[PDB]
Write a protein that binds this ligand. Structure first.
Ligand code: PLM
Ligand code: PLM
Ligand code: FE
Ligand code: FE
Ligand code: MN
Ligand code: MN
Ligand code: MN3
Ligand code: MN3
Lengths: 285, 285
């Protein structure tokens, strides 16, 4: 439908808006290019591994590659809905958000190509719980915004995307990568990429916090919805974590070879801790 | 609706896709930040001008500020429609496209703020022809893609957006800016910004060419649609150009002060030339 006018003709950008400030930071801190990462040592590492060691790393890469691809596609409805509400500074920031996720897809796909597994179908490592989050609940909640941009809908979208997928699962994934392979001295290019992703992610999570809090600020009963939507998804979060844990416990050879005492119970407590601290970053009042 | 799978889990990015190549170039060539442009001399230039000279530059800035704001909002349906078709490399490139346009909005709005006209409503310089393109036909054609992503719809969207708004009007606007103010030695920060915009724009127009040509390649009868949609919009293109020309001829003081023989007939022929050469970049066969 028609534009009735344009904010930067009638006035200017709201230079003090929190999302204009986050946009400015995204530009300053978002120059990294996956095409510049040197994966040559990663190719040698992967080739040096036994078949049993090779498998160890793939479940986590399968979760990230599909996850980054899903969030690249699935942020578009949020950008649309806030655009239609006239939230110009949010939209500007979301152009950095979307471009970040494109680079994330690129990074994991470059790693897979470089180490020689691009032709391998890693979908085998998505269990039913993962599919419920990433194949279903995430696209459902985001696409809803095209026909329903009510405060409830927007809260639910930000909860699933920014607070669960990013703020709980992605953060725990970055922590897991470091805990395992940074210890081993394995895959330096991938770990460089992970550091860049984890930096981008701080802004993504802050968008979600801002968005949920500004709706809760209008009506503190939306706080209860936020908690409810977090708890609805917890069973699939932990069901995926338990599945990856079980895979890790069955395939021990990378841990033994590289003298990693992989503390799966500690990783599980990191996930629980992530989930709970995301809840605490939203104030009921 | 659900994701049935993910290309970068089943396989990898198509590294040879023309739009992955354009994405790669966008990252290499898209580092500029409007926040780094020094507008201090532009503020002094604008203040030094008489009121009659001040007005001269505003119609063109009004056209660009609203135009960049419109295309920032209005590219989202294209990204959605190609995402839903599975065209992952197009989507990756379109994240650079969208972020470019956000910076363009930012750049013009920073200039307006710095020279002291942010509080002025520049909508007065949008005549009926401009409104028909930017307030109506552009959003209509792009939003259509949400419910109709047929080859006809996609061709029409790319024609209005990439071939007319960008490939005809924007290009002619950049040329006009240089012809007038680069001559005068006026507004160095704005002209730095214009050079960056004009560089981004080359990729935007190439997206539109790629998109229209790949549909024409399926069925050369779509070539006739492309020409028809270009000719439908020509009356509003030139009606806006004639309006800006008339404003230029009535307010002569900047030209006299700065010894610019502004050749409005030459600018008009540049627009006609742009329109015709965009037609020629699509091959019927
Ligand atoms: C073995 C302990 C389990 C640790 C949890 C690992 C979760 C893997 C992460 C996969 C989903 C990544 C989502 C990315 C979202 C984004 O890019 O914003
Ligand atoms: C006086 C001669 C007329 C020259 C034509 C000037 C047209 C002004 C341009 C305004 C529209 C700009 C659209 C920007 C689109 C984009 O950012 O991709
Ligand atoms: Fe993210
Ligand atoms: Fe453009
Ligand atoms: Mn289960
Ligand atoms: Mn007319
Ligand atoms: Mn990501
Ligand atoms: Mn532009």
């Amino acid at each position: 439908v028609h534009h009735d006018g344009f904010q930067t003709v009638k006035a200017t950008i709201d230079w003090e808006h929190p999302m204009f400030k986050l946009y400015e930071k995204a530009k300053r801190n978002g120059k990294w290019n996956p095409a510049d990462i040197d994966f040559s040592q990663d190719q040698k590492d992967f080739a040096s591994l036994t078949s049993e060691e090779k498998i160890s790393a793939l479940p986590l890469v399968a979760g990230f590659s599909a996850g980054d691809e899903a969030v690249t596609l699935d942020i578009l409805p949020m950008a649309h809905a806030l655009a239609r509400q006239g939230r110009l500074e949010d939209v500007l920031f979301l152009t950095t958000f979307m471009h970040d996720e494109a680079k994330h897809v690129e990074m994991f796909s470059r790693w897979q190509q470089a180490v020689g597994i691009g032709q391998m179908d890693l979908s085998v490592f998505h269990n039913d719980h993962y599919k419920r989050i990433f194949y279903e609940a995430l696209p459902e909640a985001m696409n809803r915004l095209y026909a329903d941009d009510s405060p409830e809908a927007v809260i639910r979208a930000a909860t699933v995307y920014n607070m669960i997928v990013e703020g709980t699962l992605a953060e725990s994934g970055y922590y897991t990568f470091r805990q395992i392979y940074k210890k081993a001295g394995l895959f330096p290019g991938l770990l460089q990429g992970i550091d860049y992703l984890n930096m981008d992610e701080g802004r993504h999570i802050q968008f979600g916090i801002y968005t949920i809090q500004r709706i809760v600020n209008e009506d503190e009963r939306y706080y209860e919805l936020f908690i409810r939507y977090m708890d609805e998804l917890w069973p699939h979060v932990i069901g995926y974590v338990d599945y990856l844990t079980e895979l890790g416990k069955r395939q021990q050879q990378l841990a033994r070879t590289y003298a990693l005492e992989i503390d799966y119970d500690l990783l599980r407590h990191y996930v629980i801790k992530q989930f709970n601290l995301r809840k605490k970053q939203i104030s009921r009042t």
